[PDB]
């Protein structure tokens, strides 16, 4: 149907916007602390701590399959990145501090992305 096509074009355009959002958030992580999954070979206890691991590569896989239906879903995954790190790592660590800085800078980007998603529909 043409209605199903139109819904698919909206999903595609959301995907475009989320791709740009993801690039902008990831530039706020120049150390690349959040680029890839935590390795269970190198942190064998991780899944005892963290139930839903998340990272930028994993988000990019989901995005490219048009797997985010709305901004809320994409924000959920970005928040997992930050929140998982802040739980596993102590306040005095480069990892924790990197996550605080990512959260603060990412807030800026997400605030305007919400306006754009509401505005364009």
UniProtKB/Swiss-Prot annotation:
Disulfide pairs here are none
Tell me the function of this protein. Answer: Scaffold subunit of various histone acetyltransferase (HAT) complexes, such as the MOZ/MORF and HBO1 complexes, that acts as a regulator of hematopoiesis. Plays a key role in HBO1 complex by directing KAT7/HBO1 specificity towards histone H3 'Lys-14' acetylation (H3K14ac), thereby promoting erythroid differentiation.
Sequence position, cross-link Glycyl lysine isopeptide (Lys-Gly) (interchain with G-Cter in SUMO2): 41
In terms of superkingdom, the source organism counts as Eukaryota
What is said about its interaction partners and assembly?
A: Component of some HBO1 complex composed of KAT7/HBO1, MEAF6, ING4 and BRD1/BRPF2. Component of the MOZ/MORF complex composed at least of ING5, KAT6A, KAT6B, MEAF6 and one of BRPF1, BRD1/BRPF2 and BRPF3. Interacts (via PHD-type zinc finger domain) with unmodified histone H3. Interacts (via PWWP domain) with dimethylated and trimethylated 'Lys-79' on histone H3.
| Tissues in which the protein is found | Highly expressed in testis.
What is the annotated localization of this protein? Nucleus; Chromosome
Its name, as the record gives it, is Bromodomain-containing protein 1
**Which species expresses this protein natively?**
Homo sapiens (Human)
Q: Where is the Bromo domain?
A: 9-113
């Amino acid at each position: 149907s043409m209605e199903q096509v139109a819904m698919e074009l909206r999903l595609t355009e959301l995907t475009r916007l989320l791709r740009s959002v993801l690039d902008q958030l990831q530039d706020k992580d120049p150390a690349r602390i959040f680029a890839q999954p935590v390795s269970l070979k190198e942190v064998p206890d991780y899944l005892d701590h963290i139930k839903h691991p998340m990272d930028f590569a994993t988000m990019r896989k989901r995005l490219e399959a048009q797997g985010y239906k709305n901004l809320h879903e994409f924000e959920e995954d970005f928040d997992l990145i930050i929140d998982n790190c802040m739980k596993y790592n102590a306040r005095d660590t480069v990892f924790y501090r990197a996550a605080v800085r990512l959260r603060d800078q990412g807030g800026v980007v997400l605030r305007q992305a919400r306006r754009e998603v509401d505005s364009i529909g």
